[PDB]
């Protein structure tokens, strides 16, 4: 959203500066890892459907079953199909909208719509 | 650094945490 | 007038003795240093006469060769 830095003044002595989002290149940043962060807009990805297994791995089934309607899925293609059928997000006569539902799921995951996190280091 | 009171900051009531919806 | 006059204000403040050193627009606010600091944004332009030859060069633009001894 922020394309260029801007100066903001508070307390008359300290000025706030916000720069665009910076990502360091690295071969270990395979697209799956980058996408689940807020780095990339999911709109431009070619195949959002293939990322659903990643969000399944990163989130417990309980959280989705609560946020997302009827559950019990395996072979997440089935999950996408069932969610599209339930939500009416289906293409014309009558295939489910695989791309749209997956894109919406990724948007929800990245924008904090569903609860998820990474376990902190071992307590000591 | 001052003390941090994490008892505040009421966590956002995401629909996932709520038990009102279930599918068991 | 009368108490808010610039001369009256200077008399009240007791700083009218130096005189000529006052910068243009030495009002109640914007002390001499403040006026000098603010005027730098608008003073970075050259001055030319009718022809016009360069009567005054721009700031940091004297365009002269010094003796680097």
């Amino acid at each position: 959203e922020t394309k260029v830095w801007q100066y903001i003044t508070l307390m008359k002595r300290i000025f706030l500066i916000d720069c665009p989002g910076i990502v360091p290149p690295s071969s270990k940043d395979s697209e799956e890892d980058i996408l689940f962060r807020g780095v990339v807009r999911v709109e431009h990805v070619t195949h959002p459907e293939q990322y659903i297994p990643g969000v399944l791995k990163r989130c417990q089934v309980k959280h989705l079953e609560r946020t997302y309607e009827i559950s019990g899925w395996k072979d997440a293609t089935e999950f996408i199909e069932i969610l599209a059928r339930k939500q009416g997000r289906l293409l014309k006569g009558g295939e489910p909208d695989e791309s749209g539902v997956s894109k919406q799921i990724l948007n929800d995951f990245n924008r904090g719509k569903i609860p998820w996190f990474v376990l902190p280091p071992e307590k000591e | 650094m001052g003390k941090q009171d994490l008892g505040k900051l009421q966590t956002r009531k995401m629909k996932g945490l709520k038990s009102k919806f279930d599918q068991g | 007038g009368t108490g808010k006059k610039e001369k009256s204000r200077r008399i009240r403040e007791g700083d009218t003795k130096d005189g000529n050193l006052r910068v243009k627009g030495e009002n109640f606010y914007r002390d001499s240093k403040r006026v000098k600091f603010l005027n730098m944004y608008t003073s970075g332009k050259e001055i030319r006469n009718k022809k016009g030859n360069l009567i005054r060069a721009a700031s940091f633009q004297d365009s002269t060769i010094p003796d680097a001894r």
Binding site: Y7 | - | M40, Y41, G44, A58, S59, F60, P66, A68
Partner: protein, 130 residues
């Protein structure tokens, strides 16, 4: 020259700005000020940290960090700005050369004068003032 007028705003008619187009030393705690306050601009790409100093004796030359600029001729306001401007005298870290004065007081710094014009060169050359 060395002061390129930089124009800012949608209607570029209030330049009020100056850019130093020559190499300059800006110390260790430079920390650019806010845009609205800075008038003289010295780009980072032109900021030099290590200068090439040639030892008059032994014919050996070493690459040493620049410490400070003391005396730049031609309106030493440039000395305050820290511009090199071949002919300037700058402090250098002589510790590498291992120069030791009488009394055991090893010298880790000494004066040096830049001998090359950094404007047309991508390196700084100076002659050690022994």
């Amino acid at each position: 020259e060395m002061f390129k007028v930089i124009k800012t705003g949608k209607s570029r008619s209030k330049s009020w700005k100056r850019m130093i187009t020559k190499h300059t030393f800006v110390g260790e705690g430079f920390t650019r000020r806010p845009v609205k306050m800075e008038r003289i601009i010295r780009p980072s790409a032109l900021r030099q940290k290590k200068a090439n100093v040639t030892h008059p004796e032994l014919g050996v030359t070493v690459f040493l960090p620049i410490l400070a600029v003391k005396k730049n001729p031609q309106s030493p306001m440039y000395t305050q700005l820290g511009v090199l401007t071949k002919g300037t005298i700058i402090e250098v870290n002589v510790s590498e050369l291992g120069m030791v004065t009488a009394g055991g007081k090893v010298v880790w710094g000494k004066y040096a004068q830049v001998t090359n014009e950094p404007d047309r060169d991508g390196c700084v050359n100076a002659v050690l003032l022994v």
